[PDB]
């Protein structure tokens, strides 16, 4: 129960606040120091981290469903949840596996171009329609974010394009689910996370992750603590992510999640008065203008 006018601001604030700590703790865990010198045994089990995060999110979603928003049948077909989960997992795998093949568009275009495919896919598969103003706003936002994040044969770059396409397919599936089957945010989150948990669990049964991460954690129990908190930091952060997509759509969710980093950096610079580069002023101005035109005069 929230006012409609103060709905989008709530989602934006929630995601922005949650994912900042999410990233901080992800860095603290993945980087790690553990042993000393050669004993370091740097953390390399990313898939196990994603699996733990997925199971934690599923548990939190089940808690939310049982304690609140009860008496509501799902009405959604399971195969749709499975399709969304496979698309999400494939996109994440491809994105994580493209780091060591791309240098210039290394997350500059892999991310900051998240909306376009989704939007385009929505136009093609679901035959949706948006005003030309929306196209211009999305393009301006993407260009501004990409130009702001810039930091001082093309064979392997296909992986990033495949990741973007899979993300677009996931957005299309989510839009179809919410439009036709009236699936709730919590139900969608729980089912998608359960399917992803099953897939990842099947994946990590190979000795590389499970029977190695277990022993490694036994060596350094402290990590567990951080891990747990990280999981929580995802849950809340994921909740809003799976709420806005239901209330305003995958396109709005993608715009929020792709401009969150730029907003956070701008706010941190303003608070610290850091001397942002003169070029990046162009990117922030473009993003601001695109958002303004999206909100009004072409919404």
């Amino acid at each position, epitope marked *: 129960l929230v006012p409609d006018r103060l709905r989008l601001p709530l989602c934006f604030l929630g995601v922005f606040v949650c994912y900042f700590y999410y990233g901080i703790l992800q860095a603290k865990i993945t980087r790690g120091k553990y042993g000393e010198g050669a004993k370091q045994e740097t953390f390399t089990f990313a898939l196990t981290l994603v699996f733990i995060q997925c199971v934690i999110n599923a548990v939190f979603a089940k808690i939310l469903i049982q304690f609140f928003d009860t008496a509501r049948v799902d009405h959604t077909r399971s195969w749709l949840y499975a399709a969304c989960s496979i698309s999400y997992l494939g996109a994440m795998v491809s994105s994580n596996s493209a780091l060591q093949f791309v240098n210039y568009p290394t997350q500059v275009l892999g991310k900051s171009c998240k909306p376009i495919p989704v939007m385009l896919l929505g136009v093609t598969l679901l035959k949706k329609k948006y005003p030309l103003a929306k196209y211009l706003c999305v393009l301006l936002i993407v260009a501004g974010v990409a130009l702001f994040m810039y930091k001082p044969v093309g064979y392997g770059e296909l992986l990033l394009l495949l990741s973007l396409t899979l993300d677009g397919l996931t957005g299309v599936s989510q839009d179809h689910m919410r439009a036709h089957y009236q699936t709730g945010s919590n139900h969608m989150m729980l089912n998608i996370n359960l399917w992803s948990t099953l897939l990842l669990g099947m994946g990590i049964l190979f000795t590389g992750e499970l029977w190695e991460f277990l022993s490694f954690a036994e060596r350094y129990p402290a990590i567990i603590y951080n891990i747990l908190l990280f999981g929580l930091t995802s849950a809340l952060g994921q909740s809003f992510i799976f709420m806005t997509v*239901v209330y305003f759509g995958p396109l709005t969710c993608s715009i929020i999640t792709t401009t969150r980093k730029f907003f956070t950096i701008l706010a941190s610079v303003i608070l610290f008065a850091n001397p942002i580069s003169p070029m990046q002023w162009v990117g922030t101005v473009l993003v601001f203008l695109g958002l303004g035109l999206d909100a009004k005069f072409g919404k």
Partner: single-chain antibody, 235 residues
Framework: DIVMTQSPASLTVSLGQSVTISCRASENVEYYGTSLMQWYQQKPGQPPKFLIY???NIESGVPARFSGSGSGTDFSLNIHPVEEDDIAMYFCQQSRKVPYTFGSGTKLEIKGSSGEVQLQESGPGLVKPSQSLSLTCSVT?????????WNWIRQFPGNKLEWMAYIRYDGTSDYNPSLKNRISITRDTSKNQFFLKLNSVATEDTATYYC?????????????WGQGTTLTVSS
């Protein structure tokens, strides 16, 4: 609960004319840009026939004459080239909230006057007040353990429909909150049947009970219907 109102109680039209039936809801029935609205057609002495879902999507097999329009709390059903076939009562149903409600129904009249699923209901025709009643709907040509909702509906004298409850193939059941305390829906997969039990039936309960099969898509759509069983409560 949402109250559906059909403005024209009965329309007198000639052959070939265009007819528009208006249905209004007490609350917005849109859920993320989609209108959870359904239109059914019921010929005399026959179960209602599913026509439209989503307020604009014509059900497969329905003639192209029928068309739906509207949004928000106002909807309309249009049949431009009307013929003698489309002479019946037209009902508007909302699937926005759990207590699915049907409109009062609009009567349309002319001047001058193993390859499918089969449902069959059984039960006593006459029951004394305050007794317990149990109706059975038997399904043939299909299994009630497959992906389809199995609903119980009742039509009172005057053609005022009312959705009692339903049981999904998963075993999950939903009830009308008004009747949740009085009725109980169960199933028996071994015999491929499902039963509705009512406790302390009153004189008001007199009605014709149908058991229907529905699939959820832009709202619940009672696509297949049984033949209906009459129930009379008298002293």
């Amino acid at each position: 609960d949402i109250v559906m109102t059909q403005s024209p109680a009965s329309l007198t039209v000639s052959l070939g004319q265009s007819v528009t039936i208006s249905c209004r809801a007490s609350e917005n029935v849109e859920y993320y840009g989609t209108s959870l609205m359904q239109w059914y057609q019921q010929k005399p002495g026959q179960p209602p026939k599913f026509l439209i879902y989503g307020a604009s999507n014509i059900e497969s097999g329905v003639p192209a004459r029928f068309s739906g329009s509207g949004s928000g709390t106002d909807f309309s059903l249009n049949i431009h080239p009307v013929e003698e076939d489309d002479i019946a009562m037209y009902f508007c149903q909302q699937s926005r909230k759990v207590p699915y409600t049907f409109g009062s129904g609009t009567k349309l009249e002319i001047k001058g006057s193993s390859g499918e699923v089969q449902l069959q209901e059984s039960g006593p025709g006459l029951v004394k007040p305050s007794q317990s009643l149990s109706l059975t709907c038997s399904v043939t040509g299909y299994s009630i353990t497959s992906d389809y909702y199995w609903n119980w509906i009742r039509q009172f004298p005057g053609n005022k429909l009312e959705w009692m409850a339903y049981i999904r193939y998963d075993g999950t059941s939903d009830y009308n909150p008004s009747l949740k305390n009085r009725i109980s829906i169960t199933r028996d997969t071994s015999k491929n049947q499902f039963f509705l039990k009512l406790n302390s039936v009153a004189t008001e309960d007199t009605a014709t009970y149908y058991c229907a099969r529905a699939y959820y898509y832009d709202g619940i759509n009672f696509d297949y219907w049984g033949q209906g069983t009459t129930l009379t409560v008298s002293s």
